[PDB]
Amino acid sequence: MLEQPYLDLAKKVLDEGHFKPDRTHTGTYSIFGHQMRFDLSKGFPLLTTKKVPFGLIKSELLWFLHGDTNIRFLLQHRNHIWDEWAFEKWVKSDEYHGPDMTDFGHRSQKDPEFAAVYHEEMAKFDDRVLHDDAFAAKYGDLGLVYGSQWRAWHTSKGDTIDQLGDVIEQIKTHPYSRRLIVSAWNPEDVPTMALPPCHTLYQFYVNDGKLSLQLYQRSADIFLGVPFDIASYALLTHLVAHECGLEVGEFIHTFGDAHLYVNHLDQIKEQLSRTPRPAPTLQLNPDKHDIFDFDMKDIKLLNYDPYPAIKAPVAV
Amino acid sequence: MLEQPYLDLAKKVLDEGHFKPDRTHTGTYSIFGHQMRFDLSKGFPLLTTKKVPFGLIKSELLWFLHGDTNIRFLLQHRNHIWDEWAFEKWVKSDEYHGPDMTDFGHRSQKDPEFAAVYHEEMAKFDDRVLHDDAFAAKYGDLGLVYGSQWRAWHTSKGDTIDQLGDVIEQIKTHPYSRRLIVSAWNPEDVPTMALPPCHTLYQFYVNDGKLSLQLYQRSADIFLGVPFDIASYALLTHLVAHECGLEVGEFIHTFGDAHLYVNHLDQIKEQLSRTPRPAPTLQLNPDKHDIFDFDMKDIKLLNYDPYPAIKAPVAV
Numbered sequence A, B: 001m002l003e004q005p006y007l008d009l010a011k012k013v014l015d016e017g018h019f020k021p022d023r024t025h026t027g028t029y030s031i032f033g034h035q036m037r038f039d040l041s042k043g044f045p046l047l048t049t050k051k052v053p054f055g056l057i058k059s060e061l062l063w064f065l066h067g068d069t070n071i072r073f074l075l076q077h078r079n080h081i082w083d084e085w086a087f088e089k090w091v092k093s094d095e096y097h098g099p100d101m102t103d104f105g106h107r108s109q110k111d112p113e114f115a116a117v118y119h120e121e122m123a124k125f126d127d128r129v130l131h132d133d134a135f136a137a138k139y140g141d142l143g144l145v146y147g148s149q150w151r152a153w154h155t156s157k158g159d160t161i162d163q164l165g166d167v168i169e170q171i172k173t174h175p176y177s178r179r180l181i182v183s184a185w186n187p188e189d190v191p192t193m194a195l196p197p198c199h200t201l202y203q204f205y206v207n208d209g210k211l212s213l214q215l216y217q218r219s220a221d222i223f224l225g226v227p228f229d230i231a232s233y234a235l236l237t238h239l240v241a242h243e244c245g246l247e248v249g250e251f252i253h254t255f256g257d258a259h260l261y262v263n264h265l266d267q268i269k270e271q272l273s274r275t276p277r278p279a280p281t282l283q284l285n286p287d288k289h290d291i292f293d294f295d296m297k298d299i300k301l302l303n304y305d306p307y308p309a310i311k312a313p314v315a316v
């Protein structure tokens, strides 16, 4: 099946995976150096062995393609992947005058009392970001997130570069270019950033009329993160291909530190006992070509028949 | 043998390698996406199937580690790898009042007359860079070459970042960090640069007391370039390991566009008919630890018994 490489990655890390401490305090099983190849002409790489929320992937990816860095758009689309980060900022400023939301995340999973209190407080924050237009501007804007890295790279001369836009133009004018790279890693910023981008950079390639893309992900959570990452970049490959009027080639996923958190081993083995089903199809609005103008209704995933969802705790 | 992965890369590109036009006008055979793994505890990855000049690799690498961007240092060490680039600049300014050094490189290989004239003119330029202290400052300084990318990244606030230095400090204080990345790709600069760096970025990794490194090379000339690239980064891995007092792990070489220029096929097959010999050893000065203070005499390659050199034309 199309997802076999991902299951193979799950196996070897379990086998060859050498223990390694980490940032949080849940140990990990890690490997270093690995590459996966997904032939996009054979189906869409959304896992069938475990239900993955494709709705969350589209909305997030669009948020990126719009050069947007504000969480209002995501909330506006029921997406809550980036809430925690904007929330951390809110809670730490002189304006917050609520409960003990200090070092929250870990504590939420710790005890019932807080899990509710935190959820009450979070909801309130989201509400303001959704309606208090000025609040959204202060505590809702993440600042240096992918959207601004891909489409508004700040230069040392006060300007902003639209890396992705220019790369798309290069594809159309010089398809056989080996310089079609887009970078998310900026040495000036990583030092103080909350979370240096995991998807460090990606490169485009054209031949035989097909576009392929290789991603370099410095760090990867094999159970919870990788199933999403494959989908966001495989999707992106389709989009750029559509805009440039090309056929899709492959998505090549390269890793630095690929790891399986220790508290996910049962679920991972749980997942390794099922048989992958045929891959879903992806059809895009043929009327629209400029991907920067895409909306949710423009991307349609066809007949995705996955196994039930598998729950697991976030390593904090 | 240790170099088998490189020969395997030579084979498949010859086999799977699909034709693809390129920047110059010598066609190429290309593949996209590929990774090699060199266990540095088994020997040093300098090719035995064809004599590779290790002297040129050390001098160039030191030039990088010194944050230096001036060609005087290289010439001072009989290294001429970066001459052409500084030369191009000289020839194109109001000060040059010599012959028809216009669009030179290609023409040199074209006809005898020019090949000599160009060599006479080049030598003169080098001489000044070596002795005319002020000339060396104008036409000898390459500007944005690896040395300044790795050790003097310019920020949007007038400062400079020593990426490599800081990464070395992170290794020593937080060995299990998945953020030990060093980037050579700066979106602000690539637009006008003569040659965007091929060695886009590299990542460090620590486990079991051993340091490993993965490189992401957007473009690679399989015959003339790759044998050098492996050596420079394998060497670098040893150095950082030595300074941080760690054992060497592996060097993982990842490629974007790996290609074999059409006018190198005979030589490549010529090279594929020999049997690799045992790998040379690398011993470093045990008295010195700060690699930024290393000199040529500090790096010693032991018993490297290679096959004769194979000549081939530069694709221009």
Ligand SMILES: Nc1ccn([C@H]2C[C@H](O)[C@@H](COP(=O)(O)O)O2)c(=O)n1
Pocket: A023, A195, A196, A198, A219, A220, A221, A222, A224, A225, A226, A228, A229, B178, B179
């Ligand atoms: N979609 C995502 C988002 C994040 N991560 C993971 C990588 C690491 O598990 C953690 C970041 O930790 P660190 O910055 O120290 O690498 O988040 C991932 O694999 N996929």
Ligand SMILES: Nc1ccn([C@H]2C[C@H](O)[C@@H](COP(=O)(O)O)O2)c(=O)n1
Pocket: A178, A179, B023, B195, B196, B198, B219, B220, B221, B222, B224, B225, B226, B228, B229
């Ligand atoms: N040591 C080096 C130096 C350069 N290159 C090669 C990669 C390409 O063959 C060419 C650069 O072309 P472009 O910038 O269009 O990729 O130089 C390489 O492989 N190894």
